[PDB]
Design a protein around this ligand. Structure first.
Ligand SMILES: Cc1ccc(NC(=O)c2ccc(CN3CCNCC3)cc2)cc1Nc1nc(-c2cccnc2)cs1
Ligand SMILES: Cc1ccc(NC(=O)c2ccc(CN3CCNCC3)cc2)cc1Nc1nc(-c2cccnc2)cs1
Lengths: 301, 301
């Protein structure tokens, strides 16, 4: 029983975090086999900032300009290359703690764990969702660039996010581990801002099912709606439209509770139109949308 | 920027989790040096449950009755003893991954990270607070007993909680690592239930300061209250009384924001008496009380 924001155990990732220094700039790198991955803006200098050309800047670098530190051990850089917005630094030592891993790009609405690091040292772990506008609402201070986001499937770490920057509204933007940004953002100083966001409807429904699994039932009703009439109401409250595929994904939770998806949608419609009226669901006074159907099944069978 | 429920990196603890089996009962143990620690009710059998005597039950056990598995390796038990409500199993191998550690008992209102484990394998990590009634609102399924709660200070793990049981309202109860229960609970089947709880006032104030540090300011006011008139209002809403020591602990946050503690208390008083009126603070629609002043300073300078 109970339901918490839960992250994956971070040990497999902690053994991969290193510190990368270029001149007076220090951030975090990810050390897998004989390669270190880090944000390319580590080579940015002062009088660049505005309109940098990273191709020019990297051509002017030498291997000895990059200082890589794995705890108290310095790693010798023997090659370097640009991988879109990430730098690949070949080192003379393969990481003995390299886990089984994959580089995977996630979709809006999916969740992952973030290991926040400073100076190559892990600081804390938390759980995030990729928003509809391709930002994440993280917790990051200056020096956290290069921190990574990940999921774990059995023994294999799926890396999906490297942290690059903070936007004016305090939300965060980054790339996959191939160096391709999530969303329409660039690693330089522009007036760029996050687009509009929506609520992840399938996730809210998943969380209502977690509530019922845990004994919170006050929001349930005898009513059932159609998928069409539900989406009419969802647009008014800036929820994502619900599709038949979302209904299928909620099948297992629907079977376990005996509550059909379209019956739970009639509860969500009433909560939107009336509010909670002073009550809470799973300790929250608003509808939470950062738990996937998978997160729910994993945490509370 | 940003503020998240954040747990400590769990790698140092993951390397200590093992699986302990007695007969048909399997749960989690903590392997430090040449000792495994686990809940003593692993020796409970069926026709005991009601009124067990653990002294009798342990006298009837032999070392070979305990099967300890560290991943794919079986550890040989060479001694056993009762430590209040925890069992100490001496094994023939010292854990090569033993971190620097301490056994520390925490106070209500303090927080810690929980590494939930099943069959000796870590499953997820999350952050908890010890409540005023000595329960924690965790996320635990059958088989999670022996999972531990901890904090990390530099390189040293302070273990503070081992999980033992779930209470009827779905909250959780356990012991420190010396085997002494938090609160008036026993490891047997009785009608025991959690006592009444209060809101941790110093933590709510810490979280309001985190909100101001992150740019959420709508709840601020020009007013200041006395410590006496604030506590008059806190009792009506079931908040813990605020003391001068709490004011001192909030000093650093007060200095950084320029908002005196008693000025922030006049904001808390108005939120209690009027509510939020449809707005949120740090993404929450209620006042959060599971972040300590230390948690806040650590996460957002
Ligand atoms: C997208 C991007 C492009 C270029 C840079 N690098 C710079 O702007 C930069 C690099 C080097 C210098 C020169 N030195 C100045 C003195 N300190 C050492 C560096 C000055 C500025 C950083 C970023 N990303 C950043 N993310 C943050 C940040 C803040 C809070 C939370 N998460 C990320 C600050 S900067
Ligand atoms: C406090 C306590 C005292 C004694 C026991 N052990 C038993 O009740 C017990 C032990 C052995 C057996 C016999 N076998 C029965 C068939 N399965 C194997 C065991 C039957 C019952 C467990 C506990 N603690 C428990 N915590 C949970 C629990 C559930 C969900 C989340 N967190 C903890 C279930 S039981």
């Amino acid at each position: 029983s109970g339901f918490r924001k839960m992250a994956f155990p971070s040990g497999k990732v902690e053994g991969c975090m290193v510190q990368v220094t270029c001149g007076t700039t220090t951030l975090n790198g990810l050390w897998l086999d004989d390669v270190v991955y880090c944000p390319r803006h580590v080579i940015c200098t002062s009088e660049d900032m505005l309109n940098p050309n990273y191709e020019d800047l990297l051509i002017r670098k030498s291997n000895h300009n990059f200082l890589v530190q794995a705890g108290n051990v310095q790693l010798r850089v023997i090659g370097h290359s640009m991988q879109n917005c990430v730098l690949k630094l070949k080192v003379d030592t393969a990481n003995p703690k390299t886990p089984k891993y994959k580089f995977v790009r996630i979709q809006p609405g999916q969740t992952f764990s973030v290991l926040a690091c400073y100076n190559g040292s892990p600081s804390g772990v938390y759980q995030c969702a990729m928003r509809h506008n391709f930002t994440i609402k993280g917790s990051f201070l200056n020096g956290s660039c290069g921190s990574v986001g990940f999921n774990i499937d059995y023994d294999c770490v799926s890396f999906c996010y490297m942290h690059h920057m903070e936007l004016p509204t305090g939300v965060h933007a980054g790339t996959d581990l191939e160096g391709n940004f999530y969303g329409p953002f660039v690693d330089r100083q522009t007036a760029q801002a996050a687009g509009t966001d929506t609520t992840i409807t399938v996730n809210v429904l998943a969380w209502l099912y977690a509530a019922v699994i845990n004994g919170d039932r006050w929001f349930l009703n005898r009513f059932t709606t159609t998928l069409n009439d539900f989406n009419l109401v969802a647009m008014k409250y800036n929820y994502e439209p619900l599709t038949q595929d979302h209904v299928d994904i909620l099948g297992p939770l629907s079977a376990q509770t005996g509550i059909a998806v379209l019956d739970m949608c009639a509860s969500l419609k009433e909560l939107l139109q009336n509010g909670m009226n002073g009550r809470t669901i799973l300790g929250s006074a608003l509808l939470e949308d950062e738990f996937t159907p998978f997160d729910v099944v994993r945490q509370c069978s």
